[PDB]
Each structure stands twice: as structure tokens, then as C-alpha cells.
Amino acid sequence: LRVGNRYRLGRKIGDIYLGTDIAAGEEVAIKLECVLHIESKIYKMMQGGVGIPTIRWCGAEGDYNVMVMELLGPSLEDLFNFCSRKFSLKTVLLLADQMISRIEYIHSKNFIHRDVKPDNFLMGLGKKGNLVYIIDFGLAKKYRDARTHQHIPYRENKNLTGTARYASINTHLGIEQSRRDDLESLGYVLMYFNLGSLPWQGLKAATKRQKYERISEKKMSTPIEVLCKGYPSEFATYLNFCRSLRFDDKPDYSYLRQLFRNLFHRQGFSYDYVFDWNML
Numbered sequence: 001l002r003v004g005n006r007y008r009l010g011r012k013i014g015d016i017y018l019g020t021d022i023a024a025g026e027e028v029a030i031k032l033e034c035v036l037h038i039e040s041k042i043y044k045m046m047q048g049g050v051g052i053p054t055i056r057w058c059g060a061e062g063d064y065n066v067m068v069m070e071l072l073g074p075s076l077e078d079l080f081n082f083c084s085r086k087f088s089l090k091t092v093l094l095l096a097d098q099m100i101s102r103i104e105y106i107h108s109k110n111f112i113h114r115d116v117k118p119d120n121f122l123m124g125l126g127k128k129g130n131l132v133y134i135i136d137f138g139l140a141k142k143y144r145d146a147r148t149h150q151h152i153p154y155r156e157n158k159n160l161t162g163t164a165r166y167a168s169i170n171t172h173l174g175i176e177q178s179r180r181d182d183l184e185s186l187g188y189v190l191m192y193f194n195l196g197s198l199p200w201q202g203l204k205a206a207t208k209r210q211k212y213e214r215i216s217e218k219k220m221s222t223p224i225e226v227l228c229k230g231y232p233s234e235f236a237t238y239l240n241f242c243r244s245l246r247f248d249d250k251p252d253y254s255y256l257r258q259l260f261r262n263l264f265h266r267q268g269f270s271y272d273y274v275f276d277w278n279m280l
């Protein structure tokens with residue numbers, strides 16, 4: 001099995017397959033879509049940013065649309081499970097700094113991601129093992145004009161495009177997603193790493209609609225101070241800041257990063273850039 005006259009298809013690794021660039025000799029990741037183009041154009045617009053994967057090829061192969069990406073490593077959800085679903089505070093703070101910057105970069109390129117979750121952040125392999133990458137622009141959306149920075153308008157009655165567990169409250173309410181919502185989702189991700197789960201995780205119903213209402217109801221009835229009880233105040237400050245942003249507001253990314261850098265300092269952690277999964 002060969003795609004693009006250049007890549008040998010290997011075994012399933014996640015429908016994601018390991019592949020081999022036959023000419024260069026390097027391994028790649030291959031995504032197959034049964035007869036992706038839109039997503040490739042967003043990746044291309046994002047290319048050249050820290051933690052943005054490079055796309056090596058995209059085309060047509062039989063009854064499949066194919067995309068080939070540089071090989072990355074396990075996702076943060078994979079590594080969370082590998083660490084028995086608990087991260088040290090230091091690892092959470094190291095991840096927070098990078099993840100805020102990845103989201104800022106996407107926003108600087110005029111898009112919102114709309115599905116921020118642990119499964120969409122992958123660690124690099126090899127010399128890039130300490131670098132957090134962001135993937136999956138299949139739900140991303142342009143929120144402003146590149147030159148004038150004129151914002152898309154406020155709208156309601158929007159379907160939940162994302163993952164319910166990490167969706168912002170405004171997303172549950174059907175409001176058009178904007179920059180604030182990517183960051184609020186990240187806030188839930190960070191408390192998820194701290195807690196091992198979220199209070200609304202695992203709620204079930206007969207149909208998705210009832211399930212989402214269940215999650216929305218619990219999310220709305222859980223104050224930030226209760227969610228973050230027993231953890232450094234910075235996590236609540238982060239979430240409160242994100243919920244205070246208006247639809248069109250430009251987030252103060254530097255302030256949010258400084259929250260966690262300040263806590264990093266007060267905790268006495270060392271500048272050795274070692275994550276938990278490398279030191280079980």
C-alpha cells in the first residue's frame with residue numbers, strides 16, 4: 001500500500017497510520033478520508049509557528065483523500081493515562097504555558113480552534129519531545145479579516161461544535177464561539193489534569209441532546225471556586241478571567257501566562273524542563 005507514489009503505508013497507530021517516506025527514509029503519520037481539503041488549507045496558513053505540525057503531502061488515492069504529516073508522539077490524554085491520570089503541578093504549569101501560546105498563535109492567524117482538549121495536543125518525538133503541538137483544524141473557523149481585523153458578528157442558536165466535556169458555558173448556550181472560548185476550554189483542561197476528571201464527566205442520557213443539557217446544567221451549577229477548591233488560586237483566576245471576556249475581546253495572553261509563571265516561582269520549582277512521564 002503506497003500513497004502519493006512516495007509514502008509506504010504502515011500499521012494503524014491511532015484512522016491514523018504510521019508511514020514511511022521511501023525517498024527520505026523518515027517515518028510519517030497518514031490520515032485517510034473516504035471519498036480534509038479545507039483542513040489542509042488551514043494547516044498551510046498556520047505553517048511556521050512553534051508547535052504547528054508540517055504537512056508533507058495531501059491528495060487523492062483511490063477512494064480516499066490522504067494527508068501526510070510529520071510524525072508526532074502520544075497525545076496529552078495518552079500521557080495522562082500513562083501517568084495514572086495525575087500530573088504534578090509542575091507538569092501542569094509547564095503545559096499551561098505552551099498551550100496558551102499555541103492558542104495565541106492560532107488566534108494571531110485569524111482562526112479559532114473550537115475543539116481544545118487533551119486529545120488534540122501531541123508531544124513531539126526525539127529532539128522535539130519537550131514541545132507541545134496542536135492538531136486538528138477540522139472544526140476551526142476564521143473569526144476576523146486578516147488585514148482589517150474586523151470580527152465576525154455575535155450570533156446565537158449555534159450547534160455545539162466541539163467536545164462537550166471541555167466546551168465553554170457560552171458554547172453550551174449556543175453562542176458563536178470566539179477567542180475567549182478556546183481559552184475557557186483550556187481552563188477546564190488544566191483543572192482536568194489537576195483533578196483526574198471533571199464533575200460533569202461521565203454523565204449519561206438516552207440521546208446526545210439530553211446528555212449535553214446534563215453536562216451544561218452541571219457546568220453551570222458548579223461555581224469556579226468549588227471546581228478549583230484545594231488548588232492554587234491561579235486556576236480559578238484564569239477561569240474567571242476567561243468568563244469575564246466579551247465576545248469580541250482580545251485576551252491578555254501574557255497576563256494568563258504570567259499567572260502560572262508566578263505560581264511556578266512561588267512553588268520553588270526548578271527550570272529543569274522535565275515532564276512527569278519522563279520521571280515516573
Ligand SMILES: COc1ccc(-c2cc(C(=O)Nc3cc(-c4c(-c5ccc(F)cc5)noc4C(C)C)ccn3)n3c2CN2C[C@@H](O)[C@@H](O)[C@@H]2C3)cc1
Binds near residue numbers: 070071135
Ligand atoms: C518508535 O517510537 C515511537 C513512539 C511513539 C510513537 C507514536 C506516534 C503516535 C501518533 O499518533 N502520532 C501522530 C498522530 C497524528 C494524528 C493525526 C493526523 C492528522 C493529520 C495527518 F496528516 C496525520 C495524522 N490525527 O490524529 C492523530 C493522533 C491524535 C492519533 C499526527 C502525528 N503523529 N502514537 C505513538 C504511540 N502510541 C501509543 C498510544 O498512546 C497511541 O495513542 C500513541 C500514538 C511512534 C513511534
